[PDB]
């Protein structure tokens, strides 16, 4: 039961957020943000650059000074504040769900039922962690009392993508704020609106000035400024593997700030012959087409056992063909437009490469509307490992279906990738589930399911899909600076 | 009561260690390792470079293959092997203590009682972690069974310094091997002998070929080869902040391998007026002069309250003057020579800089012997924050003594550094100890003691002194790759 | 600045709570609950017995059945429910604060600011734990995948006292509900009203029927019925050491249900000569006189160093004499009446005993008003260890001041008790604080403070003061049953 | 590879172990220990009673005094000693393996390869936990520094059974000693020899006097003295559910000492139709017949799905018939004699009762030899839930085979028991394994395996099979007393 959306939600925030105040970029320059469904401009947004980031870092640093409201605040109260933020977000759930769709292109029903639900669940999860991330008392040798203090890492720079604007923001603010840090966030230029509105709610929730600062702008400008800043203690990046490299290099070249990376992938979805056919087909479809295929953990390599290959392919094609593409605000819509023109063109480029390489085009393969960035649900069959569409992240509605024979074989092929963000196994056999779930070199391996995210279960990648983990208790590790205090005592006893 | 050392221990290992075999460099080239006490060459060592590193990485990769002896081995048995290694090291304790001194210069009494004790204690500590670093079963939403697998990160490249050859090796091998990883270790060209011998013991301990591979050689050559290798999953470096940046840069430019850094520092030792004078004076002396002042956490900025300044300085100068400098094999010797000519010259350069800037030279200040790299225990009084000797890591027997008035003042001054490896507070007052230990931005804050390391308590830096932590349970984080496995279940129940 | 209290709150709940419904005792019997300030009956309450408890256990058991709403409910949602319960309690804070005073006698200012604040904090704290008490994935030998499920203990019987009605209820419900258990609670016959109203809010909060059942009644009847019940999986009791013995015996004689006990004590408050006099005096007074001295961890043994003894005693008597005793609803009141006539008489008996034994009565020692159960703040000086008032829990406004000389002496004397719930050390010296906090055999040692409770810090007794802990992460251990699942896999790897 | 056993090992220890010395009972009385294979007396053993226990408790209490060798010892050193004890046991493996069989009756091959291997693994495992059971630093509200100290519980009474003499000793000594506690152990009168010899090794290993005291004797005498002792802080019992209740009552009646219990069971071994027949048959045989059927977690209720019932029974009967019964020192021997005459007769009694109730006797059913306590491997078919042999712990070579149809059916039938120690599920289906492993109310659920014990995985019972857990990290909870130290600080900061 979803409330009726406002298909033209008003924009109240489009500037730079620093010290709980709205500012225009120092240069006074702005950039337009487009509605991917119409190709039309929504509004103008403050284009932050290095000088703006510098202002934000100074505000954050200030808020992190020993004896400041944020440093002196009870850990339990940070939990109250995070829960309050979640309440304000839920209060404006219908509005944000619409604004998310307006700016991003994803179906409103999904923004409402999936996106914001996961935002609330994440913040509320982390509100619980606020006063429970214990340090330790250590049984060190000699007459000493040793213990550790789990302190905040300090000023954290958080750079996020455009595929899940609100959720990606939540995945960052939740753990950072729960551990007492201060942030300077760089939202994606393609989808800055929703995160900016949340900042208004952060001020309403009562978070002290400078605790959270949002700088909307471009990557090589605002982004690089954060990653290279001499006073940024930590940087958390989510985006392309390519920019992940740029981020780590910048950290090493600057002040050696701690780094975590949530990059891309080419996750294999393995379908064994003893799989529940209906279930595997519907799930494999979701595994790839979810969020216009714009998901890092997209099951873009569907390996199907040869015995059930034909039937699986047949049903998959049928399901893809029936997938309703259209205006994201229409409840009938299963797939909206791609985020922007650049992405739209890149996907079309890959589709063309798929055909050129000899991949069997089974359906779709072209534009789905003469307005907006709509692409037809595309399916390629008989894909080979060496093919470009089987190695590179397409980030669109393009499905690769490969055929395999043995379990040993599929393990090697699934693992022969520089990525390793996710993986999936569909089987009814206990031994096969365990054999594969252990053999697969991926951050997350789903069995008889896909895209199952839990604020309590960590998510991150193996190899070049990233480093470090988000969500769960693990998501706190990167936002903590450990201090050992070893005190001399008159006489130590057990 | 140390056993009689063999002042001229024979060298049995001087090559490259790969697959439990000794190999000459592909180029057949060798480099000499010198005895800092005599300036004479001890022997020739195989000079490993990129091609040799590639041989080691291939060996380690092979040893990490699913189904291999190392991957199939019980975690508990890894602990057995680590305890075995420890036994072999304890059997050859006097030999290794002597060889350590021969190649490093540090007093034999210290190599035996301190260095090798801490090696044994670190290895035995981690042997216990081998089968206790549990993953988790998570209470995720929906009908799913979610749990994490704490897998080894993979091929770990480990680059270490020369100040504590054996100890630094242990600090790395302990956690890496305890978690089931394989390594390619690059020992310091100045002190490669002992670590190579330990490799012999690893083979005798029963570790499978390729699990631990050691490549002796230079930094820009062997070291950079490791940090830039496309098949090294993680890299752990300990050394200068300068090279730390090169390491992180190389990681980002290559395969995005995980990185932890244990860099240098300019640690402040704070002496409050209510401190036990005698203890503070002796501890302060040890805090700086320990290991010829060649310790990362050396208390190179001794802040003393104005009320007890004069007396503390007087007593400090007296203690430095009586510090016996001589042949490291002489039981009377408290301080041996600096590791090499480069360090020798660099320290002398800093001493000259101290004088040039107006720092009051109180004692020492020059060469202590016409043979070997001996430098006199030097003390500078009335040091100011802006002076070079008050800002840069001298890494030699040079003590800086500064005067302060208030506790708020010393906090700001102590924290006014791009370093933050350690710190110390000497006071009898409960409130002062707590206030200071909290306020100080250091990775380890010692209260009424200094240089108290515990295999159970984490060690690492804040700011540019590094990232990550070694020792304790934390030492295991960087050597684990988390895998979330979420399985679909008929119906989840609490 | 507390809201004006309704000095005669209306009672809405006075029956037995089962399956979210109100029932009269099967016997139809009722018992009166008295207002200790007036001695007048407030109202009648349903007198539950064995048969009523049998109904409650059946309801609880039913709600705990696999597949039931409560068992299927997401752990995160349990958190939501607990946070909701907390909001309702806060909504009705002014009413509940008043009712707590009317039924218990403690000052309204304290019920509002202290009691209810701690209720909220406890509940919100535990709401956070709901989805974070992870099980483990274990690195067992051989080809097996071993892990542990942290399941609910099941049906938990919870018996609580009357000194902190609301608080004692929260400390029991928070951890139990957060872990997914169902409870059958037996509230103290002296103060049953507030807990009954909270049951109403539990229904309003949305907790499934039978998850929380509350049976008001007497101990030998209702309490024993729960303790000896063949279908209660676990019992958590808080009360006198006497009854704790009865509870553990009952559990052993019945179904071997798991038991944890929070009994009484005779906690020592040690005042060293270098302690801040003003602070020590005010704190020691609070340590004993808090909640009319009706606190399990009251510092009933104030040890003061001989050099500052006379001064401390003099100030203490002055503080006790100025303590305003009166109508708990009058904002001027610091001390209300004892809970009931039984306690009133028991305290009077202890006061007479103290005089009889030769303890120097310094002030008070008699009845404070001719109506209600008010007793004058009493102070006994020169108390000796063998004295009864120095060994037994008085649970009334009767302070015992003992004199000591050395620190070794006081340690032995403080530990010479069968109790060991809490202890306190007042000193400015770092070494004294560490020496004593380690030496003292007490569940909680406060340094330079008293009665500092934190929903995140455990609380429990050493020796006969109890077993198991409450609050903190520790409070969840007793509400969890661990299940090890060891699965056979094709080939185990790290 | 099994070394040749000494069929008549000499006995060196047969007295009471207190303060590292051997004592005769105060009464000078002794009791005989019989060789179950011959019925002949091996030797006389000191008969400890209350007065002896009192001596042992006084010795243990002394060794636990603050400032004592054991209390001051480094946690890591405790680990050294535990590993030392393990080495000494391995040195005397062959001897202890023989003496274990001589006194217990189990096959020597099993005593060597299984029993002593598990002892060694348990000890070495816990040696590792010595310095890793961290306390916590807690984020409490207000200006305070709160942390917890994980202290030893104190004097621990440990009463164990006779089925696994050495192993049961290890399971108790490992966790207790690793946590710094002192023990008073009451070994089974039936098998006291081996435990007394290990006491010798304890002294040789270097454990301080009074740390481990061993009192051989009877239950109602020595055992009850321990459980009822006013100075025993905690009791850990492993035996019959019946005595478990006596133990808990004793603790409640005395000083409210902490209690954990490892009682018996009537564990279900569920074989679904899709199970690997050969494997299920061989494992089910092992599940019951292991250690002459004298195992607490014995799969005494073998449920088999109707479709594979006949085949399963046929094969099981054939396997039971071929099971070689004989002299435990003969390599061919799979099954030795029962521990003693009492068990021998009790088991025969149950066999009679089984026939009486209409259970289909398929094989065995009587005495296997006219000397010693040998019983034929017995199998009963068509067992019904209501039968005595399907409800009571037989603790002998008597197999119960029940037939079932559905999975929902088998869950309720398996759970319909007051016991809940273990359970097993044999199936190839992933969903069935997870459904059953979650549904079964057992402390341990083995999937496609049985009797898989891991020092790292917890073991304990649900319901009346016990409370608390042994092995793994959990095994340390019962041996730790949590102390919370809450210190006032000038100003708390994150
Ligand atoms: N924090 C410490 O423990 C520590 C250790 C060593 C040196 N220092 C500082 O560094 C100075 C001396 O240099 P050093 O040799 O001791 O340290 P370093 O940073 O030069 O080298 C440490 C390790 O890194 C290797 N290495 C060198 N260049 C490398 C490169 N480009 N890429 C990869 N690896 C490389 C070296 O061979 C060695 O194994 C001292 O004067 C002192 O200021 C601090
Ligand atoms: Mg847009
Ligand atoms: Mg050298
Ligand atoms: Mg009352
Ligand atoms: Mg016997
Ligand atoms: Mn981009
Ligand atoms: Mn260098
Ligand atoms: Mn009572
Ligand atoms: Mn018995």
PDB file of C-alpha atoms in Angstrom, chain B residues 134-266:
ATOM      1  CA  UNK B 134      35.487 -16.253  14.619  1.00  0.00           C
ATOM      2  CA  UNK B 135      33.233 -14.848  11.940  1.00  0.00           C
ATOM      3  CA  UNK B 136      29.565 -14.251  12.748  1.00  0.00           C
ATOM      4  CA  UNK B 137      26.008 -15.562  12.314  1.00  0.00           C
ATOM      5  CA  UNK B 138      23.866 -12.488  11.691  1.00  0.00           C
ATOM      6  CA  UNK B 139      20.165 -11.799  12.544  1.00  0.00           C
ATOM      7  CA  UNK B 140      19.317 -10.295   9.124  1.00  0.00           C
ATOM      8  CA  UNK B 141      15.705  -9.435   8.136  1.00  0.00           C
ATOM      9  CA  UNK B 142      13.558 -11.765   6.039  1.00  0.00           C
ATOM     10  CA  UNK B 143      13.798 -15.542   5.661  1.00  0.00           C
ATOM     11  CA  UNK B 144      17.569 -15.863   5.412  1.00  0.00           C
ATOM     12  CA  UNK B 145      20.493 -17.425   7.244  1.00  0.00           C
ATOM     13  CA  UNK B 146      23.296 -14.857   7.102  1.00  0.00           C
ATOM     14  CA  UNK B 147      26.880 -15.440   8.280  1.00  0.00           C
ATOM     15  CA  UNK B 148      30.417 -14.243   7.563  1.00  0.00           C
ATOM     16  CA  UNK B 149      33.552 -16.182   6.735  1.00  0.00           C
ATOM     17  CA  UNK B 150      36.824 -14.728   7.999  1.00  0.00           C
ATOM     18  CA  UNK B 151      39.075 -15.824   5.170  1.00  0.00           C
ATOM     19  CA  UNK B 152      42.776 -15.012   4.694  1.00  0.00           C
ATOM     20  CA  UNK B 153      43.438 -11.851   2.655  1.00  0.00           C
ATOM     21  CA  UNK B 154      45.795 -13.874   0.434  1.00  0.00           C
ATOM     22  CA  UNK B 155      49.333 -13.113  -0.725  1.00  0.00           C
ATOM     23  CA  UNK B 156      50.703 -10.593   1.748  1.00  0.00           C
ATOM     24  CA  UNK B 157      53.721  -8.482   0.925  1.00  0.00           C
ATOM     25  CA  UNK B 158      55.613  -7.461   4.046  1.00  0.00           C
ATOM     26  CA  UNK B 159      58.368  -4.854   4.048  1.00  0.00           C
ATOM     27  CA  UNK B 160      60.274  -4.221   7.270  1.00  0.00           C
ATOM     28  CA  UNK B 161      63.008  -1.886   8.662  1.00  0.00           C
ATOM     29  CA  UNK B 162      66.385  -2.573  10.287  1.00  0.00           C
ATOM     30  CA  UNK B 163      66.023  -1.330  13.891  1.00  0.00           C
ATOM     31  CA  UNK B 164      64.432  -4.554  15.161  1.00  0.00           C
ATOM     32  CA  UNK B 165      65.131  -7.163  12.411  1.00  0.00           C
ATOM     33  CA  UNK B 166      63.794 -10.234  14.208  1.00  0.00           C
ATOM     34  CA  UNK B 167      61.023  -8.498  16.150  1.00  0.00           C
ATOM     35  CA  UNK B 168      59.691  -6.714  13.038  1.00  0.00           C
ATOM     36  CA  UNK B 169      59.657 -10.038  11.201  1.00  0.00           C
ATOM     37  CA  UNK B 170      57.712 -11.655  14.038  1.00  0.00           C
ATOM     38  CA  UNK B 171      55.208  -8.773  14.211  1.00  0.00           C
ATOM     39  CA  UNK B 172      54.285  -9.510  10.599  1.00  0.00           C
ATOM     40  CA  UNK B 173      54.538 -13.319  10.336  1.00  0.00           C
ATOM     41  CA  UNK B 174      52.611 -13.907  13.559  1.00  0.00           C
ATOM     42  CA  UNK B 175      49.180 -12.506  12.500  1.00  0.00           C
ATOM     43  CA  UNK B 176      49.586 -13.285   8.785  1.00  0.00           C
ATOM     44  CA  UNK B 177      50.385 -16.963   9.338  1.00  0.00           C
ATOM     45  CA  UNK B 178      47.858 -17.283  12.188  1.00  0.00           C
ATOM     46  CA  UNK B 179      45.045 -16.257   9.837  1.00  0.00           C
ATOM     47  CA  UNK B 180      46.124 -18.596   7.045  1.00  0.00           C
ATOM     48  CA  UNK B 181      47.855 -16.142   4.689  1.00  0.00           C
ATOM     49  CA  UNK B 182      50.999 -16.555   2.598  1.00  0.00           C
ATOM     50  CA  UNK B 183      53.799 -13.979   2.525  1.00  0.00           C
ATOM     51  CA  UNK B 184      56.562 -12.445   0.428  1.00  0.00           C
ATOM     52  CA  UNK B 185      58.791 -10.590   2.887  1.00  0.00           C
ATOM     53  CA  UNK B 186      61.284  -7.889   2.029  1.00  0.00           C
ATOM     54  CA  UNK B 187      63.831  -7.513   4.817  1.00  0.00           C
ATOM     55  CA  UNK B 188      65.955  -4.377   5.234  1.00  0.00           C
ATOM     56  CA  UNK B 189      69.182  -4.485   3.199  1.00  0.00           C
ATOM     57  CA  UNK B 190      71.060  -3.238   6.296  1.00  0.00           C
ATOM     58  CA  UNK B 191      69.965  -6.211   8.423  1.00  0.00           C
ATOM     59  CA  UNK B 192      68.989  -9.252   6.323  1.00  0.00           C
ATOM     60  CA  UNK B 193      70.900 -12.071   8.059  1.00  0.00           C
ATOM     61  CA  UNK B 194      68.737 -13.025  11.072  1.00  0.00           C
ATOM     62  CA  UNK B 195      65.462 -12.990   9.117  1.00  0.00           C
ATOM     63  CA  UNK B 196      66.990 -15.331   6.541  1.00  0.00           C
ATOM     64  CA  UNK B 197      68.019 -17.725   9.295  1.00  0.00           C
ATOM     65  CA  UNK B 198      64.480 -17.681  10.693  1.00  0.00           C
ATOM     66  CA  UNK B 199      63.343 -18.767   7.213  1.00  0.00           C
ATOM     67  CA  UNK B 200      65.489 -21.878   7.664  1.00  0.00           C
ATOM     68  CA  UNK B 201      63.651 -22.516  10.947  1.00  0.00           C
ATOM     69  CA  UNK B 202      60.244 -22.022   9.265  1.00  0.00           C
ATOM     70  CA  UNK B 203      61.117 -24.889   6.888  1.00  0.00           C
ATOM     71  CA  UNK B 204      62.271 -27.021   9.834  1.00  0.00           C
ATOM     72  CA  UNK B 205      59.050 -26.134  11.679  1.00  0.00           C
ATOM     73  CA  UNK B 206      57.120 -27.828   8.915  1.00  0.00           C
ATOM     74  CA  UNK B 207      55.419 -24.918   7.115  1.00  0.00           C
ATOM     75  CA  UNK B 208      54.461 -25.880   3.536  1.00  0.00           C
ATOM     76  CA  UNK B 209      56.688 -24.524   0.691  1.00  0.00           C
ATOM     77  CA  UNK B 210      55.664 -21.084  -0.520  1.00  0.00           C
ATOM     78  CA  UNK B 211      53.798 -20.099   2.640  1.00  0.00           C
ATOM     79  CA  UNK B 212      56.619 -17.772   3.707  1.00  0.00           C
ATOM     80  CA  UNK B 213      59.042 -16.469   1.079  1.00  0.00           C
ATOM     81  CA  UNK B 214      61.820 -13.977   1.823  1.00  0.00           C
ATOM     82  CA  UNK B 215      63.455 -11.693  -0.740  1.00  0.00           C
ATOM     83  CA  UNK B 216      66.492  -9.761   0.554  1.00  0.00           C
ATOM     84  CA  UNK B 217      67.408  -6.698  -1.480  1.00  0.00           C
ATOM     85  CA  UNK B 218      66.941  -2.970  -1.848  1.00  0.00           C
ATOM     86  CA  UNK B 219      63.804  -0.900  -1.432  1.00  0.00           C
ATOM     87  CA  UNK B 220      63.323   0.811  -4.856  1.00  0.00           C
ATOM     88  CA  UNK B 221      63.980  -2.594  -6.397  1.00  0.00           C
ATOM     89  CA  UNK B 222      62.537  -5.501  -4.398  1.00  0.00           C
ATOM     90  CA  UNK B 223      60.323  -3.371  -2.184  1.00  0.00           C
ATOM     91  CA  UNK B 224      58.610  -1.391  -4.950  1.00  0.00           C
ATOM     92  CA  UNK B 225      58.216  -4.628  -6.928  1.00  0.00           C
ATOM     93  CA  UNK B 226      56.128  -6.051  -4.083  1.00  0.00           C
ATOM     94  CA  UNK B 227      54.007  -2.931  -3.530  1.00  0.00           C
ATOM     95  CA  UNK B 228      53.282  -2.634  -7.288  1.00  0.00           C
ATOM     96  CA  UNK B 229      52.720  -6.330  -7.963  1.00  0.00           C
ATOM     97  CA  UNK B 230      49.437  -7.180  -9.698  1.00  0.00           C
ATOM     98  CA  UNK B 231      49.121 -10.379  -7.654  1.00  0.00           C
ATOM     99  CA  UNK B 232      49.819  -9.146  -4.129  1.00  0.00           C
ATOM    100  CA  UNK B 233      46.497  -8.827  -2.317  1.00  0.00           C
ATOM    101  CA  UNK B 234      47.768  -6.940   0.704  1.00  0.00           C
ATOM    102  CA  UNK B 235      50.872  -5.041   1.721  1.00  0.00           C
ATOM    103  CA  UNK B 236      52.081  -4.188   5.225  1.00  0.00           C
ATOM    104  CA  UNK B 237      54.893  -1.679   5.506  1.00  0.00           C
ATOM    105  CA  UNK B 238      56.918  -0.407   8.448  1.00  0.00           C
ATOM    106  CA  UNK B 239      59.424   2.373   7.890  1.00  0.00           C
ATOM    107  CA  UNK B 240      59.746   6.084   7.118  1.00  0.00           C
ATOM    108  CA  UNK B 241      56.617   8.194   6.595  1.00  0.00           C
ATOM    109  CA  UNK B 242      58.246   9.187   3.307  1.00  0.00           C
ATOM    110  CA  UNK B 243      58.365   5.673   1.846  1.00  0.00           C
ATOM    111  CA  UNK B 244      54.949   5.020   3.383  1.00  0.00           C
ATOM    112  CA  UNK B 245      53.512   7.471   0.873  1.00  0.00           C
ATOM    113  CA  UNK B 246      55.348   5.713  -1.970  1.00  0.00           C
ATOM    114  CA  UNK B 247      53.821   2.425  -0.775  1.00  0.00           C
ATOM    115  CA  UNK B 248      50.224   3.685  -0.685  1.00  0.00           C
ATOM    116  CA  UNK B 249      50.694   5.363  -4.068  1.00  0.00           C
ATOM    117  CA  UNK B 250      52.014   2.115  -5.595  1.00  0.00           C
ATOM    118  CA  UNK B 251      49.024   0.223  -4.173  1.00  0.00           C
ATOM    119  CA  UNK B 252      46.502   2.607  -5.710  1.00  0.00           C
ATOM    120  CA  UNK B 253      48.341   2.630  -9.042  1.00  0.00           C
ATOM    121  CA  UNK B 254      48.471  -1.166  -9.225  1.00  0.00           C
ATOM    122  CA  UNK B 255      45.804  -3.683  -8.126  1.00  0.00           C
ATOM    123  CA  UNK B 256      44.284  -1.697  -5.245  1.00  0.00           C
ATOM    124  CA  UNK B 257      45.838  -4.081  -2.679  1.00  0.00           C
ATOM    125  CA  UNK B 258      44.920  -3.531   1.003  1.00  0.00           C
ATOM    126  CA  UNK B 259      47.427  -1.376   2.911  1.00  0.00           C
ATOM    127  CA  UNK B 260      48.563  -0.860   6.516  1.00  0.00           C
ATOM    128  CA  UNK B 261      51.413   1.442   7.503  1.00  0.00           C
ATOM    129  CA  UNK B 262      53.590   1.567  10.623  1.00  0.00           C
ATOM    130  CA  UNK B 263      55.587   4.754  10.145  1.00  0.00           C
ATOM    131  CA  UNK B 264      57.766   7.068  12.255  1.00  0.00           C
ATOM    132  CA  UNK B 265      57.093   9.654  14.932  1.00  0.00           C
ATOM    133  CA  UNK B 266      58.188  12.467  17.262  1.00  0.00           C
TER     134      UNK B 266
END
